Design a protein around this nucleic acid. Structure first.
Lengths: 80, 205, 82, 86
RNA sequence: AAAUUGAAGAGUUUGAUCAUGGCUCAGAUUGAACGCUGGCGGCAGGCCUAACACAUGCAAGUCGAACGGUAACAGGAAGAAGCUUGCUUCUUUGCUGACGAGUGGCGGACGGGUGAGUAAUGUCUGGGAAACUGCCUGAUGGAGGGGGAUAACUACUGGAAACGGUAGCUAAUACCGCAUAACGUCGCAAGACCAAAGAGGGGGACCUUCGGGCCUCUUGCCAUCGGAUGUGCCCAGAUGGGAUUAGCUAGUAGGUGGGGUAACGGCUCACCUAGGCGACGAUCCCUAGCUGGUCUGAGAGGAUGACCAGCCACACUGGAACUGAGACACGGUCCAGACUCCUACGGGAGGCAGCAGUGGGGAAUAUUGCACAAUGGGCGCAAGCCUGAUGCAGCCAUGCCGCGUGUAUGAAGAAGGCCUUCGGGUUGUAAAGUACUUUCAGCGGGGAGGAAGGGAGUAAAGUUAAUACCUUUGCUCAUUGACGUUACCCGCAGAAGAAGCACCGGCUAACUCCGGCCAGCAGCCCGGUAAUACGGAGGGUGCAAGCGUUAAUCGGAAUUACUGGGCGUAAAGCGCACGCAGGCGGUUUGUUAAGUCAGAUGUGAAAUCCCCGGGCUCAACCUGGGAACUGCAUCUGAUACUGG
């Protein structure tokens, strides 16, 4: 019921944090073609639960560091 | 902001009577109407499309005595209004105050009608209106002021108008020197020798 | 504070005031919160020159908004006429 | 300054600066006492210094020198640091 | 009911043709400039360049109902009179109306200016949480009792000045404890802790130590929780160019803990981990305030960001903090620098990118004006004071709009001018003459509206113990306008004071005469001795208080082609292939609902654009309502197609 996002984890080398890439399908404003656009977010991953490739559901929260403002909700698909 | 020079020159250039004179004579007895003005008036060169459009626009303008800025604004408003642009333009041209005063019979020419209007001798609904371009609306009552009813100009103009045709949208009483603007004239009520589409094509190019 | 006042629009020598609810620090014709009416001081008495909503005005006064003296006189005359 | 109000404001501002500086130095000293008692590991001295620091901190927060949030921060930090010893 | 009803081509490559292709033109528009000319008014606009330097005047004050006070002027005053005894003229008194300086409160962070910096530390759209918020406002309470000072002042004294120093005295709603203390703060809890200020109006008696305490009303004070407003912070998307800039980054990315902020946070520090950004353009370089909007366009787009409104940044240059609810502060503070000025040479002072204005730069942009009368703002109980905001006025044809420079008659068609086949034609009803008129300008007389309020009186109601005081509500009286000699109206006189600019070879409306590839014209394609192209004249054409030229944007240009182009020979298929990223992908079923579609909600500021009306005598202009804002987010569904 809370507004959230969904993307795949592209990096988990940092501790308690992951980098999730939110891919979106946007129509080109001029030529009308539907192009892919990637939004990479630094997400807070406590317990280090997410590996590379997991399709995770994230939500926005207060700033947790210089670049982290999103936190993890749950993992949908797990790197396989 | 006014044309003060020769009058019959305009009608000679347009090849058509523009009613720029009162009507005590025929224009044929005052000038060579069938001959264009100037040293090279005997020649008649083949007019281009732009030439014909410009000449029709100038004929309408010189008929109504309207300069180019006001006529351009008239066309702009006519193209803005709904319906056919040409009859809108001619209705906007006929709605003027000096035009109505001339058509009412208080002016021998539209120049002396404009002088009557501008000199604060014409009333609209009891209010002295001295703007020649004043748009007269239906049901308006146009009358000579008490002070100007004594002028022989209005008498001669009344007589000269009685010897003219009567417009269908004007109910005038020569005794009271007053008239009523009943309605805007339809396309079929004005002159049939005026091609509004020429002006529309000239201003839309 | 929040105040209900007039913003002098219109032309030269022919003012037309818009009764606006605005933060009292902004300029006269500047940023306002809500327009709650108008006031034409040179109306011909043939038409209307006082169409200020009293519902939202009372709602804002209930929230501590201040009423300027001219707007107070306008509210008084609107209540008397209606 | 060119305006009279600006000159009086400068005078008042420096006077208030000196007053506030004295008050702030007093409060900082009374907080440094608690911090030094924390460093020494003396819990009795730590609680004594905290009991001496709390009233003047609340008073300076009430007199407008510091915000109530800053007083609460100081109290909570020093309480959590005292509770880490005994 | 209405509020997308909208799309033009032409000249020029050739002996000629079709195509390709560039150049030029016809249209709008401007913060415009220059040349010729120039009557009036309304509405707007007016340093685009040197964010170059500034003379001078003003642009932020206010409160005696916080306080000690009395220096100034107005009064009351006790006492001494010049003496022309009813003018009383000076000796002392804060007694009061007030008020210079001073302490104190609030305001100087608003309002006003500029666009230097800023390519994202900003702006726009849409969301969010970890926050503060003076004045305004709702609720609940408290408001007790003390102290030490200090400005002013006094005395001395240092300085040219700016400005100080020492000693003594005094007040407060200035300052500081004490008491009090909860739905406030810390803490799981027990408990611990934290505030305040008076003033004014009037008064029935009781009690007065003659100041008054005592009652009532207003206002102010402190604490907490809310509202409103403002602000701080975070995320996503969008918001110029360059790859002849491909690697960048050490507080760098994250974590634990300490600190710090109103608040989250590498915001800061210690330690640890070794990451993070980047081909969806990181880094670097150049340019640039952003938006609503403006111009153009049928539209999609292109250009642009002056005025008006929102946001941001800046305040001589660089840095920094203080006070404060709010600033790291245009007309505050400290420091350093450049510059300018005063000086007694020891020291000082200043910051027009506020309103006028000056010098300079430039093709170019105005008055060193009036008033707070209206709106708004600051302070005040109020009266009121301040307000270069603002309302107006001055200058400029800079633009838009409106009006005038007369009207009617007037011929054998006068004169002169020009042409002429020498017949005449044209200028041309044009002029002269005659009759009439007086808008605007000139002189004189009336005259709205912008004016709401505020003041003094009474009367009613509320409050109260009170028929005082105060608040609200009626009515009465005398007033409040910079504009201003207003708009508008009335009278007078007389056509009297008022037409110019460009063009005439084609594109492009408009043709003849006269003076050698020269003089010259030219936006693109004339002049070598009868040039509609040069220059002059006559005539005509187009605009008209303007007309042209230049500069600039879009259109035409389908000439960067998304809508909407091409590549055999006109410019264009890599010499050929393999292939990563990327783009696309046969067919069936199920599932999801990401793209897609439908509905609803929130938002999309006002102005502007458009539609129907209204008011200015019309218009410009102002304005009511609507439509629009083609967008974004959320929620609920659809499952055909694309995707998983």
């Amino acid at each position: 019921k809370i507004r959230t996002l969904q993307g795949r984890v592209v990096s988990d080398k940092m501790e308690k944090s992951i980098v999730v890439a939110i891919e979106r399908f946007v129509k080109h404003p001029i030529y009308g073609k539907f192009i892919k656009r990637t939004t990479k977010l630094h997400v807070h991953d406590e317990n280090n639960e997410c590996g590379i490739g997991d399709v995770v559901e994230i939500r926005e929260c207060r700033p947790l560091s210089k670049t982290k403002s999103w936190t993890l909700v749950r993992v949908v698909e797990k790197a396989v | 902001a006014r044309y003060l020079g020769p009058k019959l020159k305009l009608s000679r250039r347009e090849g058509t009577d523009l009613f720029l004179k009162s009507g005590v004579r025929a224009i044929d007895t005052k000038c060579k109407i069938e001959q264009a003005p100037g040293q090279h008036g005997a020649r008649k060169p083949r007019l281009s499309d732009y030439g014909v459009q410009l000449r029709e626009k100038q004929k309408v303008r010189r008929i109504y005595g309207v300069l180019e800025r006001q006529f351009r604004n008239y066309y702009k408003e006519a193209a803005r209004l709904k319906g056919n642009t040409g009859e809108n333009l001619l209705a906007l041209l006929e709605g003027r105050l000096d035009n109505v005063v001339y058509r009412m019979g208080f002016g021998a020419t539209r120049a002396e009608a404009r002088q009557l209007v501008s000199h604060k001798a014409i009333m609209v609904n009891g209010r002295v209106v001295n703007i020649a371009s004043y748009q007269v609306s239906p049901n308006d009552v146009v009358s000579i002021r008490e002070k100007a009813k004594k002028q022989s100009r209005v008498k001669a103009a009344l007589e000269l108008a009685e010897q003219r045709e009567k417009p269908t949208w004007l109910e005038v009483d020569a005794g009271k020197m007053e008239g009523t603007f009943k309605r805007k004239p339809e396309r079929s009520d004005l002159s049939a020798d005026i091609n509004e589409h020429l002006i529309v094509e000239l201003y839309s190019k | 504070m929040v105040t209900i006042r007039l913003a002098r629009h219109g032309a030269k020598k022919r003012p037309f005031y818009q009764v606006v609810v605005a933060d009292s620090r902004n300029a006269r014709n500047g940023r306002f919160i809500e327009r709650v009416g108008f006031f034409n001081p040179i109306a011909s008495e043939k038409e209307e020159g006082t169409r200020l909503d009293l519902d939202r005005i009372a709602h804002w006064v209930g929230q501590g908004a201040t009423i300027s003296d001219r707007v107070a006189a306008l509210i008084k005359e609107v209540n008397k006429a209606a | 300054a060119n305006i009279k109000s600006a000159k009086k404001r400068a005078i008042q501002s420096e006077k208030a600066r000196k007053h506030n500086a004295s008050r702030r130095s007093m409060m900082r000293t009374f907080i440094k006492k608690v911090y030094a008692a924390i460093e020494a590991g003396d819990k009795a001295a730590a609680q004594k210094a905290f009991n001496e620091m709390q009233p003047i901190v609340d008073r300076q927060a009430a007199k407008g020198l510091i915000h109530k949030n800053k007083a609460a921060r100081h109290k909570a930090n020093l309480t959590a640091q005292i509770n880490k010893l005994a």
